[PDB]
Amino acid sequence: SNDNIELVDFQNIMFYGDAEVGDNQQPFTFILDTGSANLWVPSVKCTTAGCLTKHLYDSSKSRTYEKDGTKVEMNYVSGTVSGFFSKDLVTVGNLSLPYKFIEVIDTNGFEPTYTASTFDGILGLGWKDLSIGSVDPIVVELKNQNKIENALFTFYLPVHDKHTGFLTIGGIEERFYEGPLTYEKLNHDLYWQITLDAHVGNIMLEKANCIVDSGTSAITVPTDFLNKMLQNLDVIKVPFLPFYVTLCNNSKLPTFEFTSENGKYTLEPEYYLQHIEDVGPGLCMLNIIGLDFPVPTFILGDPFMRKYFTVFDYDNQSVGIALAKKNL
Numbered sequence: 001s002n003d004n005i006e007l008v009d010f011q012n013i014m015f016y017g018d019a020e021v022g023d024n025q026q027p028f029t030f031i032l033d034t035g036s037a038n039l040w041v042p043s044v045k046c047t048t049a050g051c052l053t054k055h056l057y058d059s060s061k062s063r064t065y066e067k068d069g070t071k072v073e074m075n076y077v078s079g080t081v082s083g084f085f086s087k088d089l090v091t092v093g094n095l096s097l098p099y100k101f102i103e104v105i106d107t108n109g110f111e112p113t114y115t116a117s118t119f120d121g122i123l124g125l126g127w128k129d130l131s132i133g134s135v136d137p138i139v140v141e142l143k144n145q146n147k148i149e150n151a152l153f154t155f156y157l158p159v160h161d162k163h164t165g166f167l168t169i170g171g172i173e174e175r176f177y178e179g180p181l182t183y184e185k186l187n188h189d190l191y192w193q194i195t196l197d198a199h200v201g202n203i204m205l206e207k208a209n210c211i212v213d214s215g216t217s218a219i220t221v222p223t224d225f226l227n228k229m230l231q232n233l234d235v236i237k238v239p240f241l242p243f244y245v246t247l248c249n250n251s252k253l254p255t256f257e258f259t260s261e262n263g264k265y266t267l268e269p270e271y272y273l274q275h276i277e278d279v280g281p282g283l284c285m286l287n288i289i290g291l292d293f294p295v296p297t298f299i300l301g302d303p304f305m306r307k308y309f310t311v312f313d314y315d316n317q318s319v320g321i322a323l324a325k326k327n328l
């Protein structure tokens with residue numbers, strides 16, 4: 001009764017899922033991004049080097065293609081893609097719907113991310129008012145069409161060298177989590193953002209904005225908060241890049257603790273260290289980056305979601321959080 005889309009890990013940094021566009025079931029690999037609200041695929045009309053190795057969309061081969069042609073640009077923090085709108089049947093797992101998406105013809109503004117990774121496009125799982133072109137979210141539409149029970153989706157992320165994951169559309173499956181599932185109300189109309197007190201040792205921010213974001217492969221921290229965290233931490237910044245290197249067993253590395261009236265969520269160093277044995281033996285990179293929003297904000301990205309099963313509920317305007325089962 002729920003639609004389960006398998007998630008594959010890529011080099012323990014990101015994860016992808018597959019979906020199809022067109023009646024001839026043209027296959028694509030997507031970053032699944034709760035932080036955006038547009039779907040895009042690279043077109044056979046693409047003029048840029050990044051498209052060379054990708055699965056490309058051919059509207060001429062799909063009888064369900066409906067021409068739109070309205071020009072559009074998606075400006076992400078990691079770069080820009082541009083093209084034009086198109087409409088065609090989009091199949092996610094065993095559910096399909098006619099859907100407006102962007103045919104991308106220029107990916108040069110999205111380098112070096114695009115050529116360095118094996119995804120074809122991005123599938124947004126955000127809120128309608130964050131989309132360009134007023135596109136109802138896939139999950140909201142599937143519910144509206146009575147193809148699913150609830151307008152919610154869940155993420156059970158894969159774990160490099162242990163198990164695959166699933167994006168489940170339409171209901172919550174017990175098999176993904178253990179202990180209590182705690183619901184945190186959205187504090188914004190159109191982001192998967194919740195209020196949590198943030199504690200890292202003696203450093204804390206009360207009632208911080210926390211964005212649960214599937215497309216961000218880091219925990220992001222306010223820059224002042226990070227600078228305090230790093231003081232006498234025996235960590236070294238990489239020349240020219242906002243990444244920090246540490247001995248993996250550095251006994252100073254702290255545990256993030258995020259609390260609500262409802263729940264307590266922790267993130268120990270094992271969840272935010274990336275081994276980099278190639279650069280040096282016993283060295284790790286912190287998957288933590290400094291980033292200032294206008295209101296002090298943390299992004300609870302991939303590292304958080306690897307530990308915690310997450311439920312994104314449109315109807316109840318909340319994020320549900322529970323400890324992910326280590327095995328299925």
Ligand SMILES: CSC[C@H](NC(=O)Cc1ccc(N)cc1)C(=O)N[C@@H](Cc1ccccc1)[C@H](O)C(=O)N1CSC(C)(C)[C@H]1C(=O)N[C@H]1c2ccccc2C[C@H]1O
Pocket residue numbers: 031033034035036037075076077078113122130213214215216217218220289291292293294299
């Ligand atoms: C609707 S869309 C426009 C939106 N712009 C904005 O709000 C403009 C904005 C607003 C506030 C700030 N203070 C800065 C920019 C936007 O881009 N939002 C993204 C989420 C976000 C939002 C805000 C900051 C950072 C990230 C999007 O949801 C997302 O996750 N992206 C873009 S493309 C992408 C590859 C799927 C992924 C990405 O860049 N990941 C990289 C990444 C990112 C930060 C730290 C390490 C890493 C490594 C790697 O994982």
Ligand SMILES: C[C@H](CCC(=O)NCCC[N+](C)(C)CCCS(=O)(=O)[O-])[C@H]1CC[C@H]2[C@@H]3[C@H](O)C[C@@H]4C[C@H](O)CC[C@]4(C)[C@H]3C[C@H](O)[C@]12C
Pocket residue numbers: 077078111112113241242289291
């Ligand atoms: C989102 C933040 C902050 C960016 C910011 O907003 N900085 C300047 C102002 C923005 N504008 C230029 C749009 C405004 C106009 C200038 S003005 O002076 O008027 O403000 C920027 C700063 C450093 C950026 C990361 C690093 O690169 C490394 C890496 C490179 C890959 O490729 C993509 C992934 C990654 C992780 C990057 C993601 C993201 O991208 C970061 C976090």
